Structures are given as C-alpha cells and as structure tokens.
Amino acid sequence: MDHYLDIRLRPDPEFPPAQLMSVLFGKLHQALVAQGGDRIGVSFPDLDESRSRLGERLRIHASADDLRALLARPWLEGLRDHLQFGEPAVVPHPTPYRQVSRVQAKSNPERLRRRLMRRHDLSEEEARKRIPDTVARALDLPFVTLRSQSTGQHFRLFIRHGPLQVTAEEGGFTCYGLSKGGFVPWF
RNA sequence: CUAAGAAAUUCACGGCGGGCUUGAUGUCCGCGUCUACCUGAUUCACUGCCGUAUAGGCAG
C-alpha cells in the first residue's frame, strides 16, 4: 500500500479521454480478476468536483509485490499508445487519506417492479401504482460506462471520493479497485 | 398638468325569375453539375441480488 503507480492520459486525436478511461478501467478490472488480491486502491489525482470530471490522470495504489504482479500481467498490451507508466515509487508520508466507493442507483423503476414481482407476486398495475416513474435517481457523480463478460449489458459505474482524513485503517478492496472500507492517500 | 376635462345610434325587413359559351390547333431544336468529408460525443443511467420498503446498500 506504500507504493503507487501513476498513469497519465496521452491526448488522443481520435478519442476523447472518457472512453479511453473506460477501456483502461475495464482492462485493469480484468487484470485484477485474473491476478486476485484485495489490496489494490484507485485514485483520481485531478478529479474535478465542479463539473464531475473524471480527470486526465490516473493513480493506482498497491504494494510492491502487487504492483509488479500487475505490470507482469500482459493486460498492458494494446494500450501503451495512449498512456504513461511511471515507476512504483513510495507514496509521500504526510498525505491525507480518503476513500473511494462505488455508488449505484435505482434509476430504472421497472427493474424494481420485476424484483417485487419475484418477491411479492404483484401485478403490473400494482407495481405501477406502488412505484411511480419519478423515483429515478440522478447522480452528479463521475462515471464510467462498461459492459461485463458475465452479462453483456452495458452498466454505468459511479466513482465518488470521500472526505480527507488524517489517518487510515486496514480495509478491503473490490475487483474494480473501489474500497469496501479502505482508504487511499491523497497527493 | 396630454386641441385638457364629458357622451347609448336604434327599432323593423323575402332579392329572384330565365338562359347551349362554342368551332379549329405540331411546342422545339441543343446540353459534362462537379470536387472533398470520423456521426459521436462516457449517448445502453443497463441486468440481477440483500431489504416489507419508493428508505438505503450490494453484485459483473
């Protein structure tokens, strides 16, 4: 956790950086699924909260063995033309800590209507009256649009950075690099 | 401080009966429309699960 690897987005004359970010995030998700482990933290060094911008720089946080296992994986092939890869340097000691969390939303009422059909055996009009169409959740959070190998539907994954703390305790990490209770340093 | 200031047009009404517009007609010769383009920007806010929950989380 003491080390970090920094990825900068090369500007692209054919693609805006958002879909490049989505592609690389899917590649690192596949790399972490293949590699395993629960000590991989993500960071957005230039996250703009004014317009919910993802940013043009990426920071991944891991240990030395985890970082060399990640860079040894051949997922990096086919993406070197658009990114920078620095060195697994030690993170600065006086750094505030913040958490990253995947915030999902119930933006589609018909999914929950189908769910309550499978839970309470209600009819179509019962679910229509019980759940209006205005219950959609709109999030002013940065997001990435990806499709999964298990389910081919394209899903949107919101990423939100927590408040700055002064210390961090041990926690877990998901397959996306998002923390289920962990923290990443800010610098 | 205005060619300032003021004001009831209104009651009633049968327009109609009749009619052959028809004869004839050459539109027409000629014609280089070209050249050059990322539709796509996160544009699939989607599928399922824990929960009575629309309250609120979780899974790829």
What does this structure look like?
This is part of a larger assembly, with one chain. The protein has one domain (3-104, 137-185): 2-Layer Sandwich (Alpha-Beta Plaits), CATH 3.30.70.2540. 25% of the residues lie in helices and 20% in strands. The chain contains four helices and nine strands, in the order E-H-E-E-H-E-E-E-H-H-E-E-E. It has helices at residues 17-35, 64-72, 109-120, 124-130, and strands spanning 3-8, 41-43, 57-62, 89-90, 97-98, 100-102, 143-147, 154-161, 184-185. The protein has a four-stranded antiparallel sheet. A three-stranded antiparallel sheet has the order 6-8-7. A two-stranded antiparallel sheet has the order 5-9. Strand 7 (143-147) and strand 8 (154-161) form a beta hairpin. The protein is globular, with a radius of gyration of 19 Å. It binds one RNA strand of 60 nucleotides through helix 1, helix 3, strand 7 and strand 8. It is classed as hydrolase/rna/dna. The entry lists the keywords Csy, CRISPR, AcrIF24. Cryo-EM structure of the Csy-AcrIF24-promoter DNA dimer.
